[PDB]
């Protein structure tokens, strides 16, 4: 709700926590040491 966005924005809270687990994401093929592997993501989180 718009009033809940203010105490995330006025006290300096970052919403970047991690990737979602509700959605049934693989989360294991998303992360491999090789940065050019097809099917992998580079960010280890984000506001979800």
């Amino acid at each position: 709700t718009p009033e809940e966005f203010w105490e995330l924005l006025s006290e300096g809270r970052d919403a970047v926590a991690g990737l979602p687990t509700d959605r049934g994401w693989d989360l294991d093929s998303l992360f491999h040491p090789d940065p050019t592997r097809s099917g992998t993501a580079h960010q280890r989180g984000g506001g979800f």
């Binding site: 926590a17 990737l19 687990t21 989360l27 294991d28 093929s29 992360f31 040491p33 592997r37």
Partner: protein, 472 residues
């Protein structure tokens, strides 16, 4: 694919799904904040307000490293009736470099569990851990040794369901999640025995089916394969499969080595199937032993396939389980893989498959000394893989032919759960897990028809809710 459908039923994974923070109930009696006393902890103060405000009172319980299996018992009897205890000794604690399983928090947690057992108190115990486990590969485990506490906790609840409450994970450094959730978490009627509090909520550990679309990527055994404990079945069948697949070099290493019952036959089989197979009587516990072993690896072939399989085990009963005991009971795997990890941090390994067991995957009586070791292996894979380093921590079920985890516990669980897995499909499961580079697969043939009345009978848990055919 049709033959990999069995592999799909073989492999599962541990995923932390957002669960409820528990139903907050006004507690009574007292809730002890059991911890150390070397450093002043704002963590103890974050728990203090929560429990005084939850209805009970807060009393400190200082526990020292191997201070005694009884001291906490008469302390609990002196304070009186207790409705539960918060173990805050596993927060912001560094790993003693002597041994991962010599972690003081593990030893004192075991001593405290047995102190409750001998004190006739019957109160739940919640071990607060500082990012000991990850809610997913998007988070890094700060200490894999702290995951040994998680594994032994999963085992403990199968022994004393009233004494064990569970584990409550919190982020590294931050204490806000404690104040926000602990009061509802410890008194929660949801039934979660595995809790991870993060800035985005509360996550419960769950078993979830791992899909196997048979990704076209193929892992090959090219290079020498450092099969720790290769003579043993857990390493033996893996070495046989490596030789079958076309491994150019094979490097079975174990303390028994050439003096093993079956070393020569195994070496002959690998030479017939593969090529350039060598068995070596070398210790894996010593860092310098592994250092000079890797230095003695011929420069003609690089090392990229460290397959750690060595593991020692005599008994896993909690009544005598102390952390120093676990340290010497399973030093082959923890110190061994730690040494190998620190050695190969400069090596371009295409595979560092850590061979753990189901003891850290789910609880198993008689495997309470095995679990902590297997759990360090799981955490190490989560971390080395969260690092730009290669990893995999397959938790094999009851191996069909091996004998290291195949003891009384194996034949016991054979009739109410996990059954023997044929190596001819377990090897394909390992190949499939290396095809996606899975961080921590769990290869097991558990039948939930008998597992439901043998795992959830003593403790109704949500851990196995995400498996669809786990209802029956």
């Amino acid at each position: 694919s049709t033959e990999v459908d069995e592999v799909s039923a073989l492999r599962y994974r541990i995923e932390w799904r957002p669960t409820g923070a528990g139903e907050p109930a006004r507690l009574d009696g007292t809730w002890l904040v059991a911890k150390y006393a070397g450093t002043a902890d704002e963590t103890s103060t974050a728990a203090r307000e929560a429990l005084e405000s939850a209805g009970a009172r807060v009393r400190e319980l200082v526990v020292d490293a191997r201070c005694g299996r009884d001291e906490l018992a008469e302390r609990l009897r002196s304070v009186g009736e207790v409705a539960g205890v918060l173990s805050l000794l596993a927060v912001d604690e560094a790993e003693p470099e002597e041994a991962p399983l010599a972690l003081a928090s593990l030893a004192d947690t075991l001593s405290l569990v047995q102190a409750m057992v001998s004190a006739e108190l019957g109160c739940p115990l919640w071990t607060v851990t500082e990012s000991a486990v990850a809610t997913g590969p998007f988070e890094r485990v700060r200490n894999a040794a702290h995951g040994a506490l998680w594994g032994v906790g999963r085992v403990i609840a199968l022994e004393n369901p009233a004494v064990w409450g569970g584990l409550v994970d919190v982020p590294a450094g931050s204490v806000a999640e404690l104040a926000r959730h602990l009061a509802a978490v410890v008194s929660g009627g949801a039934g979660e025995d595995q809790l991870a509090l993060r800035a985005d909520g509360v996550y419960g550990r769950r078993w979830v089916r791992a899909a196997a679309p048979a990704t076209d990527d193929e892992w090959k055994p090219t290079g020498t394969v450092l099969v720790t404990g290769g003579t043993g079945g857990v390493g033996g069948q893996i070495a046989r499969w490596l030789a079958r697949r076309g491994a150019p070099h094979l490097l079975l290493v174990s303390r028994s080595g050439p003096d093993a019952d079956g070393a020569g036959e195994l070496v002959a089989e690998l030479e017939a199937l593969g090529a350039r197979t060598t068995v070596a009587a070398c210790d894996v516990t010593d860092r310098e032993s592994v250092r000079e072993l890797l230095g003695g690896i011929g420069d003609d072939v690089p090392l990229s396939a460290v397959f750690h399989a060595a593991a020692t085990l005599d008994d896993g009963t909690v009544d005598t389980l102390t952390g120093e005991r676990i340290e010497r009971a399973s030093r082959a795997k923890v110190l061994g893989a730690r040494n190998l990890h620190e050695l190969t941090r400069e090596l371009d390994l295409t595979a560092f498959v850590l061979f753990s067991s189901f003891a850290s995957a789910f609880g198993a009586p008689g495997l309470g000394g095995y679990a902590p070791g297997n759990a360090y292996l799981d955490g190490l894979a989560q971390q080395r893989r969260s690092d730009g380093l290669p990893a995999t921590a397959v938790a094999w079920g009851t191996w069909a032919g091996s004998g290291m985890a195949e003891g009384p516990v194996a034949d016991r669980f054979r009739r109410h759960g996990v059954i023997e897995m044929p190596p001819e499909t377990a090897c394909r499961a390992l190949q499939n897990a290396l095809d996606r580079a899975e961080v921590c697969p769990i290869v097991i043939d558990v039948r939930w028809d008998r597992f439901l009345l043998a795992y959830t009978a003593q403790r109704p848990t949500r851990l196995f809710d995400e498996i669809d055919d786990a209802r029956r």
